Amino acid sequence: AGEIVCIQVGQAGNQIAGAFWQKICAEHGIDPVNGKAIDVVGDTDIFFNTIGDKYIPRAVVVDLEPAVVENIREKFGTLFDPKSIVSGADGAGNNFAIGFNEHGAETLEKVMQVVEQRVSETESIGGFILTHSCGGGTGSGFGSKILKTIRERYPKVPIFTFSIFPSPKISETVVEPYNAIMTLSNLIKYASCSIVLDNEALFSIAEKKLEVENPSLEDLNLIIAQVLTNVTASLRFSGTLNLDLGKLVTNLVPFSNLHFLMASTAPLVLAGKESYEKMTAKELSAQVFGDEYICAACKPTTGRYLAASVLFRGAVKTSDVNEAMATVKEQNSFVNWIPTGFKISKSETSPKDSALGVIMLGNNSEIVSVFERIGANFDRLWSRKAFAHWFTDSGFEEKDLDDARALVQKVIDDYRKLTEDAENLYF
Amino acid sequence: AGEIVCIQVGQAGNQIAGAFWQKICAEHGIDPVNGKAIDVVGDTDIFFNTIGDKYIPRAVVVDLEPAVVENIREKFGTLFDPKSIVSGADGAGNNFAIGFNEHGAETLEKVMQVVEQRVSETESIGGFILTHSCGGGTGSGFGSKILKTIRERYPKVPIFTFSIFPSPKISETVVEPYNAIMTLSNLIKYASCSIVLDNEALFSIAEKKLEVENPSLEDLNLIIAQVLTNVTASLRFSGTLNLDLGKLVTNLVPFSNLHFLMASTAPLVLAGKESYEKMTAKELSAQVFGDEYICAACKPTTGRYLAASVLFRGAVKTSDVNEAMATVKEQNSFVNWIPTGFKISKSETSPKDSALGVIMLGNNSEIVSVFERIGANFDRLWSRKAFAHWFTDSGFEEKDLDDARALVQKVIDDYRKLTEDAENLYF
Amino acid sequence: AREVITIHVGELGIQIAPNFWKYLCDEHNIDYKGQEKGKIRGVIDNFFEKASIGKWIPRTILVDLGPNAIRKVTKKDMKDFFDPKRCVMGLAGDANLFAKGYYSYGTRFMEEIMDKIQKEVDQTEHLQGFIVVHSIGDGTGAGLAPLIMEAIKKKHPKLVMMSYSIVPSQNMDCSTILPYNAILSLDKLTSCADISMIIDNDSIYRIVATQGKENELSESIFDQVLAKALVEITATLRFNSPLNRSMMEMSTNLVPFPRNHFLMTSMSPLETSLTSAHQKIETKELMQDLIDQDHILAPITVEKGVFTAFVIALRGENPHSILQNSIKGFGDRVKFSEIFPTAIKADSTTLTDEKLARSGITLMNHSGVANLFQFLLTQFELMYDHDAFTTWYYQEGMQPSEFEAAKNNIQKLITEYKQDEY
């Protein structure tokens, strides 16, 4: 019933999702380069369309790039069905306005036809997952139009977006803050939940928690993929009690515009028996809630939580969960009105490279610092109108650039006001 | 009285049967390369014709190959009587149609004369055992004509066939599905029971249950031979209460076209004291009924049983059999109409490399998955008519290829319908 | 003994003969005079005729429209081995034209050739088939080999016929009319042979040069590699192998449609003298080498095209559990159509070469053959459309529509092999 349709938009979107699909295929027991399997485990129907002995991942692959199909065959074999891959003609040169306005009506109609076919092979739609990168030209503008279009066709369906935000210190292109704000404005309006990730945080993790020396994006994507595979464990491995995407939206989002979540996982293990059997839920909870495993450039132990959820995997003792979470409640800071704090869940099936593991998600007021940095960079460039012609000559009015900024500021102000008011909601 | 005549057809047939004969000669106390013995144990008359001090295995050795006798002397010494070996002239190039149609009338007449002589040296015929491989050109087509011919001459005699089916993942030749379906069609029409074996399952067993590193077919054949020696223990070692081939057909086949059985044995021990004295019937039953010792690419713990039989060897306590089988009945799934489920037997004589051992056979609805994969591969090739000229230019009509497929589908549909109906036969 | 008759046609097929036959003589422990040298091993009868005396006679016929390839082979390179009554010699040669080999000159020798073939056939109770070794370059090879093949198929229709077609290089073996003879003769091989192996001399030259980058080799290495590939293809027809047991089984394993019979090969270690000193080639490396670019005797990358059939024949101990992991490990480098299972078959037979731990060869039915055909066809069209050198063929009876027919047949063949590419 809780069938998931993934949408992958742009180069980052496809590489991250690619790593995810190949890890999913390892846990369920499917060949990552063929889709062919004889003996599989878990509820494979949530993510794969099985025809004969081939498990076809349910995904819509989208680009503006002229040769997206060949670019996939070369890395992912025949795992993805070519009928689901939508190729483009020219491309968006890191310009939100091209991905969003000047993309071609036909390109979008084909994406929608593919989505309709994928939702037509389901007894029910459990939700959509969008994987993309906010500073690009297709994963930002086209991915944003797709969220708009999907939410208009399928309102009341939980959309989760996983996206890469600018890094806190160094930036990629000068245009990046314009692409990032307009992408964020559309995430604010259309996603049910958004997971904020960035590369600076992930690199520190790759260099300090993984054994890899001099990691590249290929290694960095295994941290993101690990977040994605763990967050879908309960869905994939069922259980009498479990978590679907609609359970996460209901429990983590207290207001409709405060859905931006942080993510953290531990242990991080590269394929092979390179891990150590710590086997302790208490240690994993202490780690997942520390600042060192957070996959975004923020410092959550200094903020305040509105809500959080923790999913434990493997043979975790009930007694250790209760004690470990008691420690977490004592050490961290929560807002009074939400009085229960957490959503807790367990899935008895172990991740393939560790007997135990933990994934945590949550609403931490600290997240505004990511948005505030983006806002400030935009304001300086916008005031001087540097690289601005690239957006207004591609269909935007100054009004749209200003309204997108205003919406972003509204979310920041709402998170901050709530957080400051919170100090006295206890007296 | 229950004398057995074995028929070995084709290269796989001869190698598998060869391993069997050499293991039988170890348990009874006969020289495996001479046939000569002074002191033997057990009822050797079931499988050997004793002349003087030489024990001559009762087997008909059949090939289309030009030098089958020399090929046997080189590996089996003088254990087999050359008068029972039927050589060919050219050979069947992995083409069922050559083994079945274009084999030479004389070749078949000689095989039948040899069979008649072997059945003429018996006070009674207990049954025939055919050993072969479904994807070959002689063990498929010629072996199939032999089943037809034997059943026409000796109706009402239990024929057991042991055969190798295509492996679930990788295949050998492109023609393999045509050879496999026509062979299966003839097994459906003429065998009393058929044991379905394949190499993918056997390799996993050889690599995980045997200590051998990098096993070859020579090692793989010792798993098949172990199934064959254990299934004939009660016949060979007598006992007041015992199992003949006619007891197995009566008890395991509820309908005339649902005789395809799975086989499983434990422990698997290579010659030498490399085993451990687990000595527990409970553990052996738990193992034989698990999926890890099944010698075919199927997963029986997820299906439903129509019937099953278990033969215990060695000093097994009655009390442990009853408790062990109670566990099996509770854990597995059976169809209601057959209300007693099992046929149980014991033979007090130990296998040579272990004090205890267990062999299990049974009708598990799961078996259709083997047949369904073969069917589907055929349908795709057959629709495109790839390598088809090789069968129609050798005497088959499209009608025969289509009728063979139809018979196979009938068996699949009957197993599946029965299995699905079964869920409500309990209410 | 299922006996095979080998026919060498043209200057190159004959040039190869001494290397091919010396390998067989050493492999089965026979000297080059046909005398036994210790214990005879393998099914010797399949390739050698037993004399009324202790001598073994190669079961073969040598055909040359001139006198010279034969004279050098039987008088200087392998004296007293070949039976002179099985040699057919003309006087004029072929002027490098297909037309002489197939229409104007070579036709007068067909009574002689078929008479010698029958004399050879009459000595054997169980004839499995014929192997015709020929160049597709020069007129004698390109012309007569198909003329001979048709004459045999019309007389012995139940036998399997295999050809070993050698494509000349664009450098050391080049000719200004190579594209005409290659297309005109592929057109006949298409209906003549049941199995047709294609070996590309340009691949041999670059492969050997690569292996030889560390040394001075020998000029004989190019011929030894070409001859060895045929010897290895035939190993399973000489030893009691669990693979390609007979020519009929090679046909059923590799050719799904009557026209799609053109096969590619891959070989490792290419030659014993190329791999000396420490050559412990583990079962694992041997199978990776066999799908490597530097072991394929064609301008083919396995990753770029589609397989229809694939058989790997190894020699020496090769544990099956390794062979299966090596095949699974091919991943998407070895890919077939969605209408086929990945029918990759592998096993091993007897080793005779005391210097090698193991070895192997593969037979592939792969769409990449279409690329060689298109290369040659494009060259044909550039010349044909502007009448280059056509007078030389018209002067000996090749009415122009004959060229047009070959052009169309090959374009259709290319189209058919590439069907799965689209």
Ligand SMILES: Nc1nc2c(ncn2[C@@H]2O[C@H](COP(=O)(O)OP(=O)(O)O)[C@@H](O)[C@H]2O)c(=O)[nH]1
């Ligand atoms: N974590 C991660 N980040 C990536 C990857 N590829 C690109 N990025 C980030 O995504 C940003 C936008 O990428 P881009 O190539 O312009 O995407 P597109 O124009 O929307 O297809 C880059 O500036 C990088 O910071 C990846 O594989 N993984």
Ligand SMILES: Nc1nc2c(ncn2[C@@H]2O[C@H](COP(=O)(O)OP(=O)(O)O)[C@@H](O)[C@H]2O)c(=O)[nH]1
């Ligand atoms: N388990 C087992 N399988 C074998 C053995 N030999 C061959 N096989 C399998 O049997 C299939 C058919 O064999 P084949 O040599 O063509 O037999 P034939 O043509 O009927 O004599 C092969 O493709 C293998 O998968 C063996 O010794 N034991």
